[PDB]
Antibody, heavy 218, light 215 residues
Framework: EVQLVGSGGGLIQPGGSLRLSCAASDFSVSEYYMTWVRQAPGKGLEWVAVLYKDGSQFYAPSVKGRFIVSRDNSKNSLYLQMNNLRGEDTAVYFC?????????????????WGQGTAVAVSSASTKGPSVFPLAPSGGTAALGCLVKDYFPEPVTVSWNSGALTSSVHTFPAVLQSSGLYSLSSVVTVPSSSLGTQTYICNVNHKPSNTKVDKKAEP | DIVMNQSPPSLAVTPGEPASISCRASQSLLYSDGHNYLDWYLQKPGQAPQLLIYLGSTRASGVPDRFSGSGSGTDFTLKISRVEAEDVGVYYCMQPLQSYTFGQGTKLEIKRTVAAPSVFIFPPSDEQLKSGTASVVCLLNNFYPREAKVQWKVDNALQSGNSQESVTEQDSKDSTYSLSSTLTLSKADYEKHKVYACEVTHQGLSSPVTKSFNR
């Protein structure tokens, strides 16, 4: 599968730096214009930088001077160096293959994207979450997971490590007055297959090394 | 320095009725190439953008037949021949010629038949209490349309200001929404009362239903 896998978001004080990367699968990063597009929380897309095959870059106004796109062929990986970071830079960052070459002719669109890597430019210190069970109605019955008081966004949550996919709702987090975010993840489940199953939610909040599992018994 | 302008900002469509989205450019996207440098990307909820159309009218690998891309010069249109539930998301145009500028995005929504919400309620945890706070949660697991009124009543007396609500993005299969209200108070104030009720109004109900629980 031709694919881009991104690594290393995080939280940083303004003026700080940060490095993002993408590791390519089934294609050589050296053979393409490689490109970075970011998305601010609630906003649309914004192109930030391109890496040409010849190593020279091109940068967007908001970012020229502070950012560098580089690649490492030996690791078939793409990099973006993010210097003198400011709040305006707080966004989800997408690496993407630009299936193009203006040395030749043809352009084939930006056809492969990384899953998006989140960057929080802030002065607050990382606050990690707490994971509370949400135990149980019809012919089916619901249960979930409350994850509360964390900074910054985001959080990773799954049901039994990928297993339970269907009838799941992980909700947008809400910003509490306290300053911290809180989010709830819940899964619709047949009351028939009652608590005789092991329902574990899997919460992960990268900005602090916090990874939790949790049964949700009544 | 090209500006993309893209309308409508949003779009509600009946499944299997067509949909148009327009991209007009501050200047021409044609070329020596005899080609139009405009692409269409669609971003489903939680996903990265995905390529749909490029060079104005070339559908891309593994993109359904019902998407087409048309237009020329300064004016282009992404056309869905018949919309399906999967198509729900934000659509963006982009020109790469100079210098990768996006449209503002037509969000697309699906006109589904009305559907009352299954309503659930969840009491504070053992451990959240064993730590001195109490969040009460109220699930509206699947419903349509979005507009849903979650009234929190403590001891059958109204509540107003101490609880926030979050709303899922339209489902990709059933075109549903879902909402998670959270009543938050100290314990302390929590253990001041007994009756704790979620009351829900919606287009698709006869009477506002009330699932609940007492201390």
């Amino acid at each position: 599968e031709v694919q881009l896998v991104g690594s290393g978001g995080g939280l940083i004080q303004p003026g700080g730096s940060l490095r993002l990367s993408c590791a390519a699968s089934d294609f050589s990063v050296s053979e393409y214009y490689m490109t970075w597009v970011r998305q601010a929380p609630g906003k649309g897309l914004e192109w930030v930088a391109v890496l040409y095959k010849d190593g020279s870059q091109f940068y967007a106004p908001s970012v020229k001077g502070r950012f560098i796109v580089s690649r490492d062929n030996s690791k078939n990986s793409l990099y973006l160096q993010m210097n003198n970071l400011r709040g305006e830079d707080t966004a989800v960052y997408f690496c993407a293959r630009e299936n193009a070459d203006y040395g030749s002719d043809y352009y084939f669109g930006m056809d492969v994207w990384g899953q998006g890597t989140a960057v929080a430019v802030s002065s607050a210190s990382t606050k990690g979450p707490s994971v509370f069970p949400l135990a149980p109605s019809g012919g089916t019955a619901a249960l979930g997971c409350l994850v509360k008081d964390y900074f910054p966004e985001p959080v990773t949550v799954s049901w039994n490590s990928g297993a339970l996919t269907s009838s799941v709702h992980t909700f947008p987090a809400v910003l509490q007055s306290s300053g911290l975010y809180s989010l709830s993840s819940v899964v619709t489940v047949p009351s028939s297959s009652l608590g005789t199953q092991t329902y574990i939610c899997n919460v992960n909040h990268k900005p602090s090394n916090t990874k939790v599992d949790k049964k949700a018994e009544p | 320095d090209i500006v993309m302008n893209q309308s409508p900002p949003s779009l509600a469509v009946t499944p299997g009725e067509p949909a148009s989205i327009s991209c007009r450019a501050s200047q021409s996207l044609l070329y020596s190439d005899g080609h139009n440098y405009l692409d269409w990307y669609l971003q489903k909820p939680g996903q990265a953008p995905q390529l749909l159309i490029y060079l104005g009218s070339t559908r891309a690998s593994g993109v359904p037949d019902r998407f087409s891309g048309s237009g020329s010069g300064t004016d282009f249109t992404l056309k869905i021949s018949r919309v399906e539930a999967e198509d729900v998301g934000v659509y963006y145009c982009m020109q790469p010629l100079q210098s990768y500028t996006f449209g503002q995005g037509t969000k697309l929504e699906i006109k589904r038949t009305v559907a009352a919400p299954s309503v659930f309620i969840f009491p504070p945890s053992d451990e959240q209490l064993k730590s001195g706070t109490a969040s009460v949660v109220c699930l509206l697991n699947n419903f349509y349309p979005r507009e849903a009124k979650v009234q929190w009543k403590v001891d059958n007396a109204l509540q107003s200001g101490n609880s926030q609500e979050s709303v899922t993005e339209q489902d990709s299969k059933d075109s549903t929404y879902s909402l998670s209200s959270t009543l938050t108070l100290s314990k302390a104030d929590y253990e001041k009362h007994k009756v704790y009720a979620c009351e829900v109004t919606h287009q698709g109900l006869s009477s506002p239903v009330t699932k609940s629980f007492n201390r």
